[PDB]
Design a protein around this ligand. Structure first.
Ligand SMILES: [Mn+2]
Ligand SMILES: [Mn+2]
Ligand SMILES: [Mn+2]
Length: 317
């Protein structure tokens, strides 16, 4: 069947911010380069994948404090102003990008394109939850965030693929367990989960996660190849029985607290309390509020992008 497309909104509109010139502006002079690029990406995806179901996954909290509680360095270098309790921290975002996110969200709401979020969770968690739950159609997760390669799945069906944006949407291809295993050396039979365990061990500087000192990606791969899983690796270390080297034992035992804390940080949540802005995840074939869509698109200088999206929708069987 047609795939359901699950879109990592922030990954995509950050990409369009940096991929479309800032001289693309609304009639009031505000840049709309990210708005244009993001709407154009939806149209490209609709044409390429021909989905019947599409969801733009939101970051109701781009840096959940429950992750920060576990590893305080998590995303810390990207915070402009920390906010207390459940108020999301102020992310360091260009001043001319923040209004464009508001424009995008306004357009999506007026059009009736499904968006989904979960309070105190990232879009990453919405994606993992909607991917894990899906029972009817193959899933395509659209993102440039490599940590989401942990979602790849073949069985149990339906399959999950990541349309990885690291080189842009035009060059993007679909990653499954095979591709993740081939590129990161994790075992095929549990490539997605093993990828998250490799990423935990080796670290993720972009997310502020140091990893385990002395266990780089090569060592992490060989230990997963030999012991199968992170849990088995820790077992081998806590257990003078095994053929684990004393050096690897020391490095792992010296990081038991970090490893336990990082597991829940690195893994996307799969049971997040996702809610939708729409009654279903069906992609509307025309704007739910066409007058408001036309007025917003004119005000935001993306009338032709919206028109091209409606042409893409019109060609769906
Ligand atoms: Mn906070
Ligand atoms: Mn992420
Ligand atoms: Mn994210």
């Amino acid at each position: 069947t047609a795939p359901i497309l699950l879109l990592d909104g922030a990954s995509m509109w950050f990409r369009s911010y940096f991929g479309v010139p800032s001289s693309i502006k609304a009639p009031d002079g505000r840049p709309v380069n990210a708005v244009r690029g993001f709407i154009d990406a939806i149209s490209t995806l609709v044409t390429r994948e021909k989905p019947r179901r599409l969801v733009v996954c939101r970051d109701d909290d781009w840096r959940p404090q429950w992750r920060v509680d576990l590893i305080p360095s998590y995303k810390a270098h990207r915070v402009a102003e920390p906010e207390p309790d459940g108020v999301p921290d102020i992310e360091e975002v260009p001043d001319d990008l923040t209004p464009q996110v508001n424009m995008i969200l306004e357009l999506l709401d007026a059009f009736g394109i499904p968006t989904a979020g979960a309070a105190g969770f990232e879009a990453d968690d919405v994606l993992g939850t909607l991917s894990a739950r899906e029972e009817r159609d193959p899933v395509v997760v659209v993102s440039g965030d490599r940590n989401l390669l942990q979602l790849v799945r073949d069985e149990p069906a339906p399959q999950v693929r990541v349309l990885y944006l690291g080189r842009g949407l035009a060059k993007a291809t679909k990653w499954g367990p095979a591709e993740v295993a081939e590129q990161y050396g994790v075992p095929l039979d549990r490539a997605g989960t093993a990828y998250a365990e490799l990423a935990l061990l080796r670290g993720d500087p972009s997310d502020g996660l140091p990893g385990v000192a002395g266990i780089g990606e090569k060592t992490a791969a060989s230990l997963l190849a030999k012991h199968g899983s992170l849990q088995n690796i820790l077992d081998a270390a806590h257990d003078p029985k095994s053929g684990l080297s004393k050096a690897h034992r020391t490095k792992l035992l010296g990081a038991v607290d970090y490893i336990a804390a990082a597991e829940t940080v690195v893994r996307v949540a799969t049971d997040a309390p996702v809610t939708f802005s729409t009654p279903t995840d069906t992609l509307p074939l025309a704007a739910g509020d066409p007058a408001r869509v036309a007025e917003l698109a004119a005000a935001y200088g993306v009338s032709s992008s919206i028109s091209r999206l409606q042409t893409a929708l019109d060609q769906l069987p």
